[PDB]
Amino acid sequence: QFNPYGDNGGTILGIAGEDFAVLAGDTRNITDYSINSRYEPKVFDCGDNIVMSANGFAADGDALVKRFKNSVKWYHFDHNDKKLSINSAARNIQHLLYGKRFFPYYVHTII
Amino acid sequence: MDIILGIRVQDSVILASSKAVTRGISVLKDSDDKTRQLSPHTLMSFAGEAGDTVQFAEYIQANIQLYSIREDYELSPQAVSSFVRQELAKSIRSRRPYQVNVLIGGYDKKKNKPELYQIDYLGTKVELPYGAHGYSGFYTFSLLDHHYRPDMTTEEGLDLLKLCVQELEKRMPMDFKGVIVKIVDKDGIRQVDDFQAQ
Amino acid sequence: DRGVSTFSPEGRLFQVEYSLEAIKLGSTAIGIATKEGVVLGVEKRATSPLLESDSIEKIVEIDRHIGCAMSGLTADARSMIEHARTAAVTHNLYYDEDINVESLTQSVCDLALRFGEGASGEERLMSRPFGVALLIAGHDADDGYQLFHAEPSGTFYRYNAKAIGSGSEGAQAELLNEWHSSLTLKEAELLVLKILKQVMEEKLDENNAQLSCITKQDGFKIYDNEKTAELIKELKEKEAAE
Amino acid sequence: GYDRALSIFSPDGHIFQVEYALEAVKRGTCAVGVKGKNCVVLGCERRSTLKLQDTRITPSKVSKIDSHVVLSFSGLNADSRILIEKARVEAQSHRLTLEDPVTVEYLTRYVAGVQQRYTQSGGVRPFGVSTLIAGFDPRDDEPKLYQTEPSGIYSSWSAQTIGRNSKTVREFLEKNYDRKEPPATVEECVKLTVRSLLEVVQTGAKNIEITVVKPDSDIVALSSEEINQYVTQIEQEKQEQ
Amino acid sequence: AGYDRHITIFSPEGRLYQVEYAFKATNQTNINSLAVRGKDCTVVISQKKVPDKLLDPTTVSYIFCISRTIGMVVNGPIPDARNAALRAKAEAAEFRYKYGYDMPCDVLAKRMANLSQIYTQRAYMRPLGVILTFVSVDEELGPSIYKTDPAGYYVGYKATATGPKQQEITTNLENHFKKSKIDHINEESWEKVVEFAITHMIDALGTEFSKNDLEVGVATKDKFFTLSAENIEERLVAIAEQD
Amino acid sequence: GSRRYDSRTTIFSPEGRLYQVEYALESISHAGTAIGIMASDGIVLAAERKVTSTLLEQDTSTEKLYKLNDKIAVAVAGLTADAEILINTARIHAQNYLKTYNEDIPVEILVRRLSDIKQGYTQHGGLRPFGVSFIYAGYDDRYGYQLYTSNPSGNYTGWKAISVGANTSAAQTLLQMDYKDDMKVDDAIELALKTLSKTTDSSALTYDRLEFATIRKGANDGEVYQKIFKPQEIKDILVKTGIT
Amino acid sequence: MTDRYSFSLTTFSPSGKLGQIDYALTAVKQGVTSLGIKATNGVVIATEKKSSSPLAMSETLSKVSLLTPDIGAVYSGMGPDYRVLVDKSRKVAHTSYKRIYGEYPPTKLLVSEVAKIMQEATQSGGVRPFGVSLLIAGHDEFNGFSLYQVDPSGSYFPWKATAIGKGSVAAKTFLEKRWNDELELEDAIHIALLTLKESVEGEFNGDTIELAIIGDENPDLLGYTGIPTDKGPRFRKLTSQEINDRLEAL
Amino acid sequence: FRNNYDGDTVTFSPTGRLFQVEYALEAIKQGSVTVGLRSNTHAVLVALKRNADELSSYQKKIIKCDEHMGLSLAGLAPDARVLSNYLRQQCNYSSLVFNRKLAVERAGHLLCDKAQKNTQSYGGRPYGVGLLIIGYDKSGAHLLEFQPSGNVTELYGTAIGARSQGAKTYLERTLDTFIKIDGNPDELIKAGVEAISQSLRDESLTVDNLSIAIVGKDTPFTIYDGEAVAKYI
Amino acid sequence: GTGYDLSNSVFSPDGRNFQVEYAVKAVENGTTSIGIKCNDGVVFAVEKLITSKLLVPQKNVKIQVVDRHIGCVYSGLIPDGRHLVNRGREEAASFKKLYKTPIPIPAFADRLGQYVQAHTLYNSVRPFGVSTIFGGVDKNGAHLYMLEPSGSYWGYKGAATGKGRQSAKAELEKLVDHHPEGLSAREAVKQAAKIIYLAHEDNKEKDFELEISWCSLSETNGLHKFVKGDLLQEAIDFAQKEIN
């Protein structure tokens, strides 16, 4: 029977300094025991000085990051180009994820 | 399951319902009142699935109250029990049925007689001198079949219950933390606050 | 007959213009925005002495940093206020922050033109335009204190001061002269209380008029009679003082 | 599918259908309510276009929304039934979810909302009704009295009247009701009520019904005699001068 | 009040003006047509008038092939006629699919009539300004002619005519049958029935026809087809050698 | 657009009246008169068949008296066809109630329901009201014998005696003149016949022009019984009451 | 698109009249005359086949229709409205009755059904009343034979004999003279033929006249045998020939 | 005449006109003037913001639809919001689904088609606002003029609103000149402000009264208001 | 009486539909456009009025393609034209999706025909304010068509609509007579540029821009393509030369 999920491996890491923050991830993408790419970026600059990564099932990870970026775009449209504070972005991400509470984005995301 | 007993004596109906509310490994409460008053002379006890139990009872209560205010009249116990049976019979064939069993005790002011109704979640209704839900009947029906008399006084009935509750506390595996008893008669509904040692 | 969304030969929407007429008949409402907060005042205008003047609510809270005054068919404002409060609360739930005053206004105005008997653009089910205008005032980090005028047309303007209701043309003229960039909250209060007195049919007292303001520090507050009564007295004095 | 805009604006900024709704209210039998210091009283006059009725069954003018709140009205009877049913239902719903009966203001705001809605919804005409809602908030003793109209607007009154000749009886009340000293008694409050009604009822022993509402769901309606006694004592106050 | 003339509601005289005016439209094309029944075929002639020189004569027709066995000629504006045709075609296809046999001529007529009856009763639907003449050689009834109008009326005919000069054509045919005492052209070949048809078309209209002035449809057992300019010319030649 | 042809059946007149409701009533006033009289031991329903012929089959006819329940019955005044629509829904509400509570529907509850339906055609829908007025004659164990009336507006009221249809004014006066609280079914029957007899627009008042019904609680039984008089039965009682 | 006519097209005038229904009745008046006569053992309904051209085939158009094997209908007014009414009537007899109780509906009930359909076209949004009046005749075990008339308003009434359309007034009068409660079916057919003659201007024979009856059961018209309780339809249309045989004894 | 044929857009007058649409166009002329012009490297929008009172703001007349497209409005503001929002979505769909920036010429076709639906159906009303759209896509700079009738036209420059005809003549004249102001935005903006003042009369463009927008080769559509436009007054 | 011309689907007493006729006025008030059917294809051309120097030349294209083998040009309310093409495109896609083969010109014509005719059946819609000339090459030949606001359409040897339709129609009739064997793709192109130049006199007041497109089995492979560059200029001259 059809299984909508998959696992593309990968590992990400986020550390917050005092006046800086870093988000790192390896660039390997896999399927079972095969390598799909040795360099497929997984951490993205989403604008407004926010970096994000949705690790796990790549298709879901991509849909999420793409959806969030678009969310930032409309935030500017709807609120006079106001900068999206990272705390605000986080609450936004929560609603994006919980929106699929009964068919989850199979990813662990960090910003 | 929880204990849900009902006895119909000469001039009233008595309802005894366990006070324990258990969730998995722990007994969360030991003072739970598994009953709702539908109208001044009609009481309903209930047992069954976790959330559906109270949701259903409060839903029925709201409806009977709305009827009372619209008509400025109190439906007969028979009428109230038919309304409730129909509700459950709808539920049984719906997407997610209410898994609730009930005892409806009321004093019919027009006939001047007490009445006890037993209705399971399938919408099965029957009128009885006494009844129960779950395993309760398995332990108490032989006692009631024996000592029950149509002319018993509210006092004799409360004694017959005590006997029933004792057999339950002896042979039943679960600790239901005793029962809360209530009387329904020509004057309304009152709670026997002294059954913890009557 | 004629559609409720028909254009006049001059290029105006009949129902919207007639809506504006009904608003002219409403009780006066005035808003003054200063760098120390925004003041909002309204004429209660009870219709009988037996009416309990304090059950007249023409200044409501949208959120802690937004409040508004209405003028016209006030019953039509109930759902607008409801939409406004929901919008502000909802925004907070989604972004863990305060909704910008402008954004909140824009949201309300979005209901404005949602009327008609089958306008091909969505599902605008509302038989007629709203018969009430609103003065929306609040504060937010990006643009500070703001005053907005929201009409049944759907358009909304920002003002430093604005008057709507029966005596708005006269009162606006007043505001024209009286307003300046360095007004203080105290001044604005007195100033609003003064213009209300000029246009109101009745003699302004703390029972037929109501003041309120919104400051970054304490948010939107409605002045209780006692507080206003004193401001009245203080006004009568400074006026008799020349 | 019928969604014609029946309530719309006219050049001068008026909504005639709402205005005409009021004209139907002016035609309704008079209704009045005065709040005492610890009670509220409702009085209603009884028409006589035809008399040979069966008072037992014939719908009475004062209706209970809940056990602590009542509603009377002036205007189209059939219309009032619709509002009353919706209010009684909203009353039960509120108890069911907030676990507390409605305040009088809440119940008023609800009915008013239903009326406002029928003024700007396609396919429907406004309610040809105006109401007086009174009672006591749960666990509160301070009397409440409100009024709603076809437009959807509402507010509270010390005393108020609606219906035919309400203009008259309002005048009486305006120069016969002191906010300083509200009828400190159920009796002197019921009298002030009957008095305002006699100004228009024109000797109506059977043309004047009165309901008294006290704190804690204490609601009772006087009988012909009980009321008839108030009239008698009132007609003397006059003659004794 | 005066709107009882804009939509299909009754007038004080119990009349439906919109239905009457729709009938008026059926003559807007100034085309006349007629149908006759042979011994085992059905023929329909209709004037073909192509005014503009820029038109493509081959695409100007008022005769339609509804199904393998049903033919339909229309009197009225082309847009309404095409609307009626598309519908009848769909109706004929569906009937076959659901009931397993070909929709009979009289049945399709009834069906279309009923559809028209509805525009007569529902206010938002305007009647179609056309008259439909259906023909075929039904497997149970034999040669058949059924015609329907904007009133939702329909009936079967021994022969019929439609258009501005309908009356002249009709009386001409009426006369011929009063004489022959039978209800059909006693001819074994459709060509002779087609010739009879065109002849009487000329008598009653008092006009001569070339090969591009007519349009002819013929229905026979299991088939309905329309003749070509040349098939017609061959017909016109035969009638020529007799007069 | 369509707006052009919309009559707007649900609007207020400048005077605050419902055009269509008033006109429907005007229609009702031309309908055969129906009388409803309530006695101490029963209720009487009488109605005058409007328009008749030598060929009209009367034994198979029923245009004014309809059974809604075994305890409720109504007399009709207005458009028969409209009445039948309402009657059928009435009969269904009665049965739903019986199925839900296992008790016959209290008379007023059924009357208020039908009236609410009518009231609806008054506030929304853009449809014409029903041109019907009903006289309800029923019995229940909370108010015993009852008598109600409902018209196009959806308003309803209770009565001891009441009439609907043509010459109501004349009829109401005649009833208000000879009615007495201590009346008896047989007295009521006779009063009903007299009233119609004096208000008819026809020559005489023959049986072939009448419909008669009574809800009595037969002493020898203990239950309520409806009786819709047959032609002969009406003819008989017409003779006895001295109308021959 | 979309029927935006959701409001009544038939409303009350200040005088209380319902214009559209009145007008519909007027349309009925201009209709060809049709009549019905109930005998002790049957009913007869008849009308004139007003051929709108000699080229037309009068048989291809029945004005008298079978609704069920024991019920027939005839009309006066707008033929197309009658045709769709007949389709609906035959269907409602099945869906609202035969598919429920396994037997055809009794005359009054079916009539009641048709009347409902007509009543709705008097109040529903965007439509006009039907422009016809029907005479429905039938038989059923518990009611015997019956005859009903149904008007554009939706009203209906039982008759011993009646006529609708053009010369209804004269026809009804002539019927009142000849009718009695001891008539045999043939007597009614004869009176029917006499009555119809006064209303027919031109030819009067079995080809210009349409006549049907509701009488005994016609086993020969059933189409099968083997089921004792099925004895055939009581509805029978007369043939041109059968009509003429009686026109002689006219 | 007219009075019998201007009740709604679904009605044609005897001469073949649609009055409701013409009336809508009238709301445009009643709107404050706005101008648009482009060289080969940039496109500029100069819009005169109008104020209610002297205690009021000068309503925003420029909306950004994407990083490479935006528009100026003249007429009913609410309608401009609806139409610019519809444009924002179409621009968004193109990027999300096809990872492609929507062509200005295409955005024009979409607006035209959206406007047209509101001129052939009962119950709806035409849009009462005019729009000037500028953008830099895969074929350079572009300027479009949108009319409520649904007519969209590509031009080198233009103006709409009250007295717009002033600036429109100026541009039609200055054509050969500004068409070559490539590589230098400040010059194109100045030519834009010169054209817009050709329709002045009342006052003179002030700091909180002027509004300018630009997009081009290496310039994402951006809005300049107040102080930011002072160096152009 | 009158008013028969206020609602789209109303028949006047003389069996007409005035709103459709008024629509035609809007069509006549528009730019002139034409269609010339040649020996193995069709050519389309239209006049584009230069309102000002501000219009970017060659940009505001008017001729539209449907699928890959059909060309459409129209006069009247432009937006209504686009609306009709969008429908045609869906119409075409739908046909190809089920039947695989690209849609035959005759079938396509009727699709547009039935749709336009639909907008003359209800008073809730307005008729189309345009006449459309369209056609292309298919399984058996080239086909040229013209559709009017009434939903009426026919096959044409040549067609014209708009302001200068008479001039064009005249020039077209000449070509028809002087070429009973059939023009050629190449020829029709120039010929078309001429007819447009000539027919421009009925609007000689404003300067214009010519637009041509064609669909020839031999010149374009049965695919609709616009005439650009050299071939276009060559035809401009041919017209500019014979316009003197």
Curated annotation (Swiss-Prot), chain E:
CDD domains: proteasome_alpha_type_6 (cd03754). Disulfide bonds: none annotated. One of its GO terms (cellular component) is proteasome complex. It comes from the Eukaryota. The modification Phosphoserine is found at S228. The proteasome degrades poly-ubiquitinated proteins in the cytoplasm and in the nucleus. It is essential for the regulated turnover of proteins and for the removal of misfolded proteins. The proteasome is a multicatalytic proteinase complex that is characterized by its ability to cleave peptides with Arg, Phe, Tyr, Leu, and Glu adjacent to the leaving group at neutral or slightly basic pH. It has an ATP-dependent proteolytic activity. Belongs to the peptidase T1A family. PANTHER family: PROTEASOME SUBUNIT ALPHA/BETA. This is Proteasome subunit alpha type-1. It comes from Saccharomyces cerevisiae (strain ATCC 204508 / S288c) (Baker's yeast). The lineage of its organism: Eukaryota, Fungi, Dikarya, Ascomycota, Saccharomycotina.
Curated annotation (Swiss-Prot), chain G:
It is found in: Cytoplasm; Nucleus. Keywords: Cytoplasm, Isopeptide bond, Nucleus, Proteasome, Ubl conjugation. GO terms for biological process: proteasomal ubiquitin-independent protein catabolic process; proteasome-mediated ubiquitin-dependent protein catabolic process. Its main location: cytoplasm. There is a cross-link at K108 (Glycyl lysine isopeptide (Lys-Gly) (interchain with G-Cter in ubiquitin)). One of its GO terms (cellular component) is proteasome core complex, alpha-subunit complex. The keyword Translocase does not apply. CDD domains: proteasome_alpha_type_2. Present with 7060 molecules/cell in log phase SD medium. Belongs to the peptidase T1A family. The proteasome degrades poly-ubiquitinated proteins in the cytoplasm and in the nucleus. It is essential for the regulated turnover of proteins and for the removal of misfolded proteins. The proteasome is a multicatalytic proteinase complex that is characterized by its ability to cleave peptides with Arg, Phe, Tyr, Leu, and Glu adjacent to the leaving group at neutral or slightly basic pH. It has an ATP-dependent proteolytic activity. The 26S proteasome consists of a 20S proteasome core and two 19S regulatory subunits. The 20S proteasome core is composed of 28 subunits that are arranged in four stacked rings, resulting in a barrel-shaped structure. The two end rings are each formed by seven alpha subunits, and the two central rings are each formed by seven beta subunits. The catalytic chamber with the active sites is on the inside of the barrel. The gene is PRE8.
Curated annotation (Swiss-Prot), chain H:
The keyword Zinc does not apply. The gene is PRE5. One of its GO terms (cellular component) is nucleus. It comes from Saccharomyces cerevisiae (strain ATCC 204508 / S288c) (Baker's yeast). The modification Phosphoserine is found at S13. This is Proteasome subunit alpha type-6. Present with 7210 molecules/cell in log phase SD medium. Belongs to the peptidase T1A family. The proteasome degrades poly-ubiquitinated proteins in the cytoplasm and in the nucleus. It is essential for the regulated turnover of proteins and for the removal of misfolded proteins. The proteasome is a multicatalytic proteinase complex that is characterized by its ability to cleave peptides with Arg, Phe, Tyr, Leu, and Glu adjacent to the leaving group at neutral or slightly basic pH. It has an ATP-dependent proteolytic activity. SUPFAM superfamilies: N-terminal nucleophile aminohydrolases (Ntn hydrolases). The 26S proteasome consists of a 20S proteasome core and two 19S regulatory subunits. The 20S proteasome core is composed of 28 subunits that are arranged in four stacked rings, resulting in a barrel-shaped structure. The two end rings are each formed by seven alpha subunits, and the two central rings are each formed by seven beta subunits. The catalytic chamber with the active sites is on the inside of the barrel. There is a cross-link at K190 (Glycyl lysine isopeptide (Lys-Gly) (interchain with G-Cter in ubiquitin)). Keywords: Cytoplasm, Isopeptide bond, Nucleus, Phosphoprotein, Proteasome, Ubl conjugation.
Curated annotation (Swiss-Prot), chain I:
The alpha and beta forms are probably products of the same gene with different post-translational modifications. Present with 12000 molecules/cell in log phase SD medium. One of its GO terms (molecular function) is mRNA binding. The keyword Nucleus applies. GO terms for cellular component: nucleus; proteasome complex; proteasome core complex, alpha-subunit complex; proteasome storage granule. GO terms for biological process: proteasomal ubiquitin-independent protein catabolic process; proteasome-mediated ubiquitin-dependent protein catabolic process. It comes from Saccharomyces cerevisiae (strain ATCC 204508 / S288c) (Baker's yeast). The gene is PRE10. The 26S proteasome consists of a 20S proteasome core and two 19S regulatory subunits. The 20S proteasome core is composed of 28 subunits that are arranged in four stacked rings, resulting in a barrel-shaped structure. The two end rings are each formed by seven alpha subunits, and the two central rings are each formed by seven beta subunits. The catalytic chamber with the active sites is on the inside of the barrel. Signal peptide: none annotated. The lineage of its organism: Eukaryota, Fungi, Dikarya, Ascomycota, Saccharomycotina. Belongs to the peptidase T1A family. It is found in: Cytoplasm; Nucleus. This is Probable proteasome subunit alpha type-7. Keywords: Acetylation, Cytoplasm, Nucleus, Proteasome. Its main location: cytoplasm.
